[PDB]
Amino acid sequence: ALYEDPPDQKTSPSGKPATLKICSWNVDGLRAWIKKKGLDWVKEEAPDILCLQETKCSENKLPAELQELPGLSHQYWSAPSDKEGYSGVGLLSRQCPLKVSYGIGDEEHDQEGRVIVAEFDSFVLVTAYVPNAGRGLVRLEYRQRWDEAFRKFLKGLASRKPLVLCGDLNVAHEEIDLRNPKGNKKNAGFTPQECQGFGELLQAVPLADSFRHLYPNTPYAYTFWTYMMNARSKNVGWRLDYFLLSHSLLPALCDSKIRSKALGSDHCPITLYLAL
DNA sequence: CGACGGATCC
DNA sequence: GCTGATGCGC
DNA sequence: GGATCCGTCGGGCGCATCAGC
Ligand SMILES: [Cl-]
Ligand SMILES: [Mg+2]
């Protein structure tokens, strides 16, 4: 079935107005995404913070349109050192963060360009591009080891502020998070190992899945569709992109959106509204 | 990774 | 410099 | 014998490199 995201709820359950709009987007190649008008969509969305994954672009190759964003003037970029053209993440913010860091512990030695941490006044924001288990699951054990190091890194963040984790976490948590659960149990993104790793992530940190907290029984809500076989037009897709929140942030949660109609990548954007 | 062919379930 | 092939990963 | 399960196959994207010119 096709899916239509509900209207934006800009008020918390208690009546407080949203003050913070965060958008996250795996752009599947930042330079291509810009040529497909992705930045025109960002401007219409007008988020306070923009997190991008799979930029596939080192900072010297960023198109100049990116410096024509006065409302997102504080920009932080990461690309892997060994393999440019893969991975790459970015974080763009209206206000300047108190602190920015990269990686999950040893990035100065294994520059992977998958994780940016930004500390703001009231919360810590992490955006992540989680490593893929690969065709035939050839890199599944690496992803399991990565999941474990990531969980431990997130638990061990020094600050006492609540945590917002967003981005492409590269797993459909439950059966409701993808169109063909049974046929994909041996495919990257839906193995029992990655699914359990996600569950452990929510328990260990601990974190809540903002969209599923608000919409616990809503099916066919996806953020990724393979370019192949016209999957997106048939809404055969997967929910791979999340906003995960500290429990203390749930009373501030107004809405968590899936921007199904925004084109330019094989993922669509997701948007978070918080009343901070 | 979904479409597809083929086997299995009652 | 530019195109289109191939290779790689998603 | 319709629905479901299960394994195999062909391949849309973006970007780096390479060959040719
Ligand atoms: Cl930077
Ligand atoms: Mg991808």
Task: Walk me through the structure.
The record marks 170 as: Transition state stabilizer. The record marks 241 as: Important for catalytic activity. The modification N6-acetyllysine is found at residue 155. This protein has 276 residues and is an alpha+beta fold. It has one domain (1-276): Deoxyribonuclease I, Chain A, CATH 3.60.10.10. Helices cover 17% and strands 22% of the residues. The protein contains five helices and twelve strands. Strands 3-4-2-1-12-11 form a six-stranded mixed sheet. Bound molecules: chloride ion and magnesium ion (MG). Magnesium ion binds at residues 28, 54. Residues 59, 76-77 line the site of chloride ion (CL). It binds three DNA strands through α1.
Task: Describe the structure in brief.
By secondary structure, this protein is an alpha+beta fold. Helix content is 17%, strand content 22%. Helix 3 (140-155) packs parallel to helix 4.
CATH-assigned fold name: Deoxyribonuclease I, Chain A
Amino-to-carboxy terminus distance: 35 Å
What series of H and E elements makes up the topology? EHHEEEEEEHEHEHEEE
- Major β-sheet profile: 6 strands, mixed
Count the helices. How many?
Answer: 5
The dominant shape is: globular
Gyration radius over CA: 17 Å
Family: Belongs to the DNA repair enzymes AP/ExoA family.
Site (Interaction with DNA substrate): 267
Cofactor: Mg(2+); Mn(2+)
Binding site for Mg(2+) 1: 26, 54, 266
Write the layout of secondary structure elements.
Blueprint lengths: L19 E7 L3 H6 L2 H8 L3 E5 L20 E5 L10 E5 L5 E4 L12 E5 L4 E6 L10 H16 L7 E6 L23 H13 L3 E2 H5 L26 E5 L7 E6 L11 E5 L2
Parallel strand pairs: 1-2, 7-8
Antiparallel strand pairs: 1-12, 2-4, 3-4, 5-6, 6-7, 8-10, 9-10, 11-12
The structure holds chloride ion and magnesium ion.
Chloride ion binds next to strand 3.
It binds three DNA strands through helix 1.
